[PDB]
Every structure is written in structure tokens, then in C-alpha cells.
Symmetry: D2
């Protein structure tokens, strides 16, 4: 019957995801964490919103890895966050989690959030043994939400009506594709030609998109709501078989001249997991930038 | 408090609109019609769905034009449907309705559905005296829903993820812009280059889009659900101040080289009605087609 | 993946159900009917609302009974509508439909609408061979929606906040239980004691509830929106495993002193179909009325 | 146009409320707090979910009280949390906030969360000068959500289908009314008679309801999701004119033999704020308990 969604890590992102799953009645939720009892407390709190939301999703905490058994969807946020130093430690967490996925829920659809996400997703893919269409990493949905939002406020249009592509990787080497931005399905260049938005404003918006997490932390907060909603958009596309075109970290098998590595690109998410991998027909200049993102991913992969 | 939505015409489209307004809790509804008591029957039926939908919208019928008083939104579907012969008769209906709008609800936001919509909308604009940003006609949201749906089924992606533009007019001279079709924000030409869809399939989809109403009637049905949902998407964008980019019939003041006439183009719909009129930067070939659509509109305008 | 919902009968109720399923993204829909091509026309129209609704449900028509194969949910509205004369004819339709359910989708959850529903549901249960927890008839959700709505308008409270029970059967012998009416969970008698509503107003509301279909038809309309939304509330409770307490026609095995017959009572609808049959602890006066409803059901059963 | 919702206090409850308002597209949000820049960080994060949620709500932070100007709805969570010692300090915060409400948004609808809520709500009512129908305190929606949820899990029914009343005050002296609990509109005593639930289980559920916040904190968490969703259910009932029957802290003018004090009771919330105050017809035993709750409120009022 209902989907079982196990959230491996019950921190701030985990809490908002659980909240949103009950709001949308997506399925039973398990808030798993290594910290004793905390996930039970959050689960209990969150379970009462079933009344207000008119839903019927069980929300429970867990301090045991075998509660992954029966998982339809597994969302990994667990991990430590000399950033390079944390690579091996987080690799160890992916290993342990991957062994339990292979044993307890080999058919689950896996979403990795732990940073560097393009690295951690491939590690978990390797340690869990799941098919390449059943594991993705969060990146482009979150990154493009900022880009799309900022442009929509300049243009005074509904945020969803702006569409944009950010590829290669999550993080500071993300590749923003100015050429692939649209507003109500209309190329953004038309709005630049009409002076509704300038290139210089768009340049500032790009830098702000790239540095948004830093901007939030400099304001004495931490990004967890947008990330959680972006993760749930991806999870919901799988569970409801929406087949939405969402930019995620996925195994590259030749696209962009790249193989044996995970990178961000538009994919189609449906009941079969990653049903399609869409390769944008980038020019040599966008390609060069894509290469830089992949190289940084490889560099960090080599230290894990 | 709640918005008051008066539906002038309580036929099949009127019935589905009332259904959808209660489903979405948009506002109180008045089902108005010249036919005695029928709108009361439909309203009564529809009023009970408040229980199932968890909403609180009053739904009442009306056989009196002064029930337009206080209208926030007015949706006109009333009219007869030698098609040219009906022009003057439907003009007479717009006149009568327009006099009551001027008198009873001059500040209402008006959506005209009655065909030929690009003609009837301008007539009602003239007889009602409302500002040009407060009256639009249904066209492109409905026409592009077919185009977007058909392409999404070939491509196996979520229907909303395909975006397309159909301009000029509603009806057989609608202008389909192949160049402005995107899939997940990605130009459709990329999918044609990749052989995921061919030009010949797209040619068949275009003809099917243009002839969809005829196709439904040849199948012994009549199009009323899609039209109703498209009308409600437009009405909801106004009421909730969504500022969605929606293609509607609106007064052209120079765009595309055209003035003093209504034609379909992407507009932004928010709390100020038509907040923006977006002029696509068409080439001479798309422009020529746009001209043909406007000329047919003018031809029928001259017979009303 | 997605649920497959087959609507056996593609008339007015069928059309609104298909509309609501796409609105709520419930599953793929098959509009089946004996009439050539009409279900194809309605399906086509309805399929375009996927764009406006942000959903991804396939909507197709069918003139073939084997399209029931794979059905998760089957909703029967097909039938002719000297009312006693139609009993055998509608029994013949249930027979034919029941043989195809047994052959094509024996594990489907079945909702019968065809009138007299308490009769037709048992007939289809017998001819289809499905388990008693997998077949129900529409009655109390629809009947109580009117009662709950009318009281909420007198009391000026949200319609869903009024709860009421109507049992025994659908139709003119429905049993309205004044004692089981609540407002925000508070006994209705308190509001009568406070003079917020009188017994005489409630008496008029009861008669109006019983005669609502007649009232709609006397107003030159026909009840199909409320029935459709009530059917979808029931279907959605099954599909999403909501476990909502909904009053439906179900097999009585001793409740109310009655066996081997279908009658309306509160049931719990979840992933296991009818998970619970709730027997209200009626007094002898409510019981007598319940008996009269069952006797009329038996009388019509004997003529089929 | 859109409602302006000012959240005075941008902590954990404030963050979830902002999240839920964008999810439901309720209106523009201001996250106000005395802490420098933090509300800006949370607002920024939360603003990006407009893309994922298909909504268009502005979300901004504020460190200035005059941003209350134009507020339609104001939700107060600000305050320190020898508990008696904090009374005067929180009274000082209500004073300051109340002066700004009177000056900047005298027509706003106010929801107070700060504890002891039944005390703080009356203080803010007095310092802000707003009409008694325009200020309420959070209590019963939150408290009954636990009670309703726990019973629904024992009974295996949808959480919303259980309705219950907790009155008098929020906090340890809350009055749980066993007599006013229903399941699908059916008295809970019927389920006790049928042995579906026992009195002893219900006794444990009552104690758990009363001690839920303590239970969450003993589990190393803190209650903020349920409280936030309960606050939003109340705010949404006002904004959308739902007229839902919700138990809130409101000015008592004679009900239950009590005056000049705020206490929890079912109220109707619509566009006119508190449209109705429903007085339950309690017996002398429930009344005695209600008195104890009011006395504790008065005791703490006298120390502020």
C-alpha cells in the first residue's frame, strides 16, 4: 500500500522533509538518525500534523538501520558538514549506509544529499549496489530554484514560470547556462533585448545563485527549507510517476564526453527511477565549464 | 472577504468552472443564465461538494442580471454557437451583458469565452467600458494545452514540463510557433536533433492541435472540460495574484504591428489584471501568419 | 505504478469523476461505455487538463470490456435510469459487467452507483465473485453531504465541520439519524437548546435532504457533480489508504439484526477495502426505520 | 491584493509557519525578530520554495517593528520560554508589540502563541486595543491534535475523523472532555461499549495528551511542527473565510460562568475574526475542571 520513506539523517533538512511528506500525504515516514531518541521526538511532533493536514501518514523515529527494510525511497542527509578532511569520514558513512541498503532495501529509490553530493552519490551507488537509474543526488533543483526565483522577482512573474538549467555539479563549480533560461517558455534574451532585464543584473543574479548558501550563513541562518522542498519534489516525481524534467546528479555514461562519474544534468524522474538522461547540446564554452565541474568532483572522489 | 465570481452562461463549461472553483475554494459562485431555474439546479448540486472538498464557497443560480453587482470576476460563456450569421446575434448578447457590467460591476475582471472569442472580447470591452487590463479572452491557454499535452505523451515527460506558444487568435487561424516550444526549459529542436521526436510527428501534432475541437465533436463529444480548466487557471492567476505568464486574447496597442484589435499573446495575469503584455520577437514568417489571424478577426468584427 | 481506474459508464457522473481524478492526480483513467466513440471524445477533452492541473494521469476512452484488465478500481454508473421495470434490465447489465470483473480484474476494488444502489451492489457482488470487503455502493456520502451542507448554512460554519449519519439505504427510505448529527464535534442538540437552530428548521432540512434529487430535477437540472465528488472521496480513501469513516452500502452480516443483504452504514475505507464495518447502536425507533429501508431493498431484489 | 502576514518571532515555530504559508500560497510573509539578520536568512531560504510549490508569496525578514504596517494577520511567538519569573518579562514584550499593533496595524487579526498563552493573549489584547473578535490564542487546536491523533491510531481510522474538545486553558490544567470525543461523527462511548478501545487505554491517552510537550523534550526534541500547523489552520480559516469550528483562547464574557478573562473554547473563525463563541453545555464536574484552569490563568495574570 503506502510508500515507505526512510530519511537517513533527522536534522533540519530531515525535519522539513517529514513535514512536507505529511502535508502532501506522500507515505509513511521513518526519521532515522544515530542520535538517541531525537528522531522519535521530531516524529512524534510531526505525526500530529496529520490532523491539520487531513492526511494519514505514519511518522516514526528510528535508531536502527534495519528499519530501512521495505523502504521504497531512501533520502540520505547524514554526514559531517579543511572540508577535504571530511571526505573519507563521509565516505565511511556512505559505506555503512550502502551495506544496509543492499541488505535491507535493494529495490529502493535513493536520493543523496550529503556534500559534496556528486561525490557522495557515486560512493553510495558503488557501496549499495543499486541500479544506476535508482540513485540520484540533489543539486540542480535546489540551485535553479534560486536562479529562477531571483529572475522572477526582477521580471515580476510567477516563480515557476522562469525555467533555467544549472549543470555539471552542485557547489561552487556549478555551471549556469544563460542560454537555457526561459520566462513563460520565452527565451530570456528577448527580455534582455526589450530592456526588461539587463546582462549586468543577470551577472549579479548568477553570482548570488552560486553564493546563496554562503549568503544565508552570513545572515546567521542555514539553508534547509529549499533543499528539503527540492528533495521532496524529486521524491514526489518518483512516487507519483510524474515524469518531471528535473536536474539531478546522475551517472554519466558518455554524455558531455564524460563517463564513470556522477554529474548534474536534466533527467526524467518517474516510476522507473531515472527514466531518461537528457544531454544538453552545449557549445564548447559551456562544455569547458562542465569539464571543470567534473574535474573537481574527481579530485574529491580521489580523496575519499 | 471572499471573491464573488459570476459565470454569465451556465452550460457545460459553466458547470465545470463552478465545480473547479469549489474544489479550489476560489470564491462564492453565481451561475447565471437566461434559462429559468437550471442554474439553480446546477448550483444546488455543486454546493454539496463543499463537504467533500473541505471548502466554503457559496454556489447559487441566478436568472437576474443585477446579481453581477459586486462581481470581482465575470466569465462569459453565454451565446449562440453559416457561423457568420451568429455574429450580430452574439454581439447583441455582449451589448446587453456589457451594459450590466458597466452599471453593476465596473471594477470586475472579465474573461470572455464566447466565440469568435477575439471578436467577442473586443465587443464586450467596448460595450462594458472596462479598462483594457481588466478584460481578456480565452484562447492560448486552451490551444497550447493540447499542443503541450500531445508532445509530452510522445516524449514521455510530465505534461506541464512542455511549454509552447500559440498566438494571433483562437480558432482555425491560430498561429503555432514551433520555435517557441520547450521541454523542461530545453528547446524542442534538441529533441528533434536527437531523434526523440521527428518534424513529421510534430507536423501531425500541430494539425491535431488546430483541429482538436473538431476531433472531439467527430467522436460524439464536445470540448468543455479543458476550456473550463483553462478559464479557471486564468481566473485563479488574477485572484491569487500569481502573475503567471498565460497566453490570452488582449488589446493590441502596436505589438506585432497591430493596433485597435484583440489578439492572442502571452500576458502576465496578477491582481492588476493584465499587468504585462509580452510581445514575442517573431520573424517575418511567423508575423505573416499572425497577420492572417488578425485579418480574420477584423473580417468577423466588421459583420457584428 | 499508478493506479488504473476504470469507469464503467461514461455519462455525466463519469465525466466529472474523470475530471476530479486528473485534478487530484489519482491514477490513469479509462472512460468505458457501450456508446461508440463518446468516451474517447470525453477522455481526449479531459486529458488536456493534465497541463493545467500539473498532473500526469492518462485518460482514455474504451468501447471494450477487456480494458478492465489490470483495474485497481472499478466504478459502475452504467444502467437504465415504472422504475421497477428497469430492475431486471439493470440486473442484466450487472451480470455482464460482473463476468468481466471476475475474468479481467478479480482483485479490483468496486464502487457501484447504479440505482437502486443497495440492490445493484449486491447483484454485482454475486456475479463478480469479489470478496465482500472489495465492493461497496454509493449512498451515505452523497446523502449526508446535503444534510451536512444545509445545516452548515443555517449555522454559518464550514460545511465539513457538520457531521451526520444517514443509514439503511440510498433513496426515499434513507434513515436520517437526528441523534448522530454534530457541529465541530459538538452534539447538534446543544445548538437546538441554544436556539441557534430549531427542530422545525431541522425537520424541513431532513425532508429537503431526502428529496434533493427531485428538487434538482424540478429545477431543470440533474444531480451529477455531488455524486461524482462523493464517489471520488470513497475511491481516494481506498487508493491513498486514508481509512476515512464513510457511510456506504456494504454487506450486512448481522449488524442491525440483518444479514445476506447490502445496506448503508459507516465503514472504514483503506488499502484493504472495507477494513471495518461500524454498527451504530441505534434505538428501537431508529432500528424500525432501518428495517423499512432493508425491506424495500429486499422487495426490489426479488424483482431483479 | 495578497494578505500580508507578519510573524513576530522568527524561531522554530516561525520558520515552519513561513514554510507552510508558501506551500499553501496564503500571502506575503514577514519574518520579524529582534535578532539581527537571522529572519533575513530564513526568509531567503524559504523564498526559493515558491518555485517548488508553484506559489507566489514574498518572504522577507525584518528587524523593524514598523514592518507591521499593513499587516492583515499577526502571529506572535516572541518571548522568553521559575517559569513564573518570565511572566513580567514576557508582559513587557507584549506591551511593546501591542503598542506597535495599535499604531501600525490596528485592523489586523492577531494570533498569540507565547506562553502562558491564555495570559499573554489577554495582555496583548489590552495593550494593542484591538476588538475582542480580532485576537485569539493558540491552544485547543494543538492540544486536540494529539488527542485526536492518538485515538485514531488505536482505532485505525483517519486522524481528522476523530474529533475532540479540550477547553479552559492551554498547558497542564487543560480540560479534556471525554464526553465530547467522536469518531466519524459517532460518540466514542460506542467504541468503548464494543471493546474497540477501553477506558484504561483512553486514560493513558489523556495523560499522554496533557504531557506531550514534556514527552517530546524528554526525547531530545522540541514541539514546533504541530504548533506551527495548528497556527496556520487558524490563520487560514480567517483569511479564506472558512468558518471552521476551532478551539482557541478567546475573551470569555459570561460563558462557563466566567468573564474578563481569556480561556479555550470552540470558536468559529471567518473573515470577521471570531464570528461565534461556542459555549459547551458542560456538567458540574467538567465545569469544576474549567474553573481550575481559569484560576491558574488568573494566578499568572496577577504576576505579570
Amino acid at each position: 500500500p503506502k510508500a515507505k520513506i526512510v530519511l537517513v539523517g533527522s536534522g533540519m533538512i530531515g525535519g522539513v522533509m517529514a513535514t512536507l511528506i505529511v502535508q502532501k500525504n506522500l507515505g509513511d515516514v521513518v526519521l532515522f538518525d544515530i542520535v538517541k531518541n531525537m528522531p522519535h521526538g521530531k516524529a512524534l511532533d510531526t505525526s500530529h500534523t496529520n490532523v491539520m493536514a487531513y492526511s494519514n501518514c505514519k511518522v516514526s523515529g528510528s535508531n536502527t538501520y534495519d528499519d530501512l527494510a521495505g523502504s521504497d525511497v531512501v533520502i540520505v542527509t547524514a554526514g559531517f558538514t579543511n572540508r577535504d578532511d571530511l571526505l573519507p569520514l563521509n565516505n565511511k558513512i556512505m559505506i555503512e549506509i550502502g551495506g544496509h541498503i543492499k541488505k535491507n532495501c535493494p529495490n529502493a529509490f535513493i536520493i543523496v544529499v550529503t556534500n559534496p553530493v556528486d561525490v557522495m552519490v557515486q560512493l553510495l551507488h558503488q557501496h549499495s549496489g543499486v541500479p544506476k537509474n535508482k540513485i540520484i543526488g540533489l543539486g540542480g533543483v535546489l540551485d535553479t530554484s534560486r536562479l529562477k526565483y531571483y529572475i522572477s522577482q526582477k521580471l515580476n512573474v510567477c516563480p515557476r514560470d522562469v525555467n533555467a538549467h544549472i549543470v555539471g555539479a552542485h557547489g561552487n563549480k556549478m555551471v549556469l547556462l544563460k542560454r537555457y533560461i526561459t520566462v513563460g517558455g520565452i527565451p530570456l534574451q528577448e527580455f534582455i533585448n526589450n530592456k526588461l532585464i539587463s546582462d549586468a543584473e543577470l551577472e549579479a543574479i548568477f553570482d548570488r545563485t552560486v553564493n546563496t548558501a554562503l549568503e544565508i550563513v552570513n545572515l546567521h541562518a542555514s539553508p534547509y527549507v529549499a533543499p528539503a522542498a527540492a528533495i521532496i519534489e524529486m521524491a514526489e516525481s518518483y512516487l507519483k510517476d510524474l515524469k518531471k524534467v528535473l536536474i539531478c546528479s546522475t551517472l554519466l555514461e558518455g554524455q558531455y564526453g564524460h563517463s564513470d562519474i556522477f554529474g548534474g544534468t536534466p533527467v526524467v524522474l518517474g516510476a522507473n527511477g531515472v527514466e531518461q538522461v537528457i544531454e544538453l547540446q552545449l557549445n564548447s564554452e559551456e562544455k569547458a565549464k562542465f569539464d571543470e565541474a567534473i574535474a573537481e568532483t574527481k579530485r574529491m572522489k580521489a580523496l575519499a
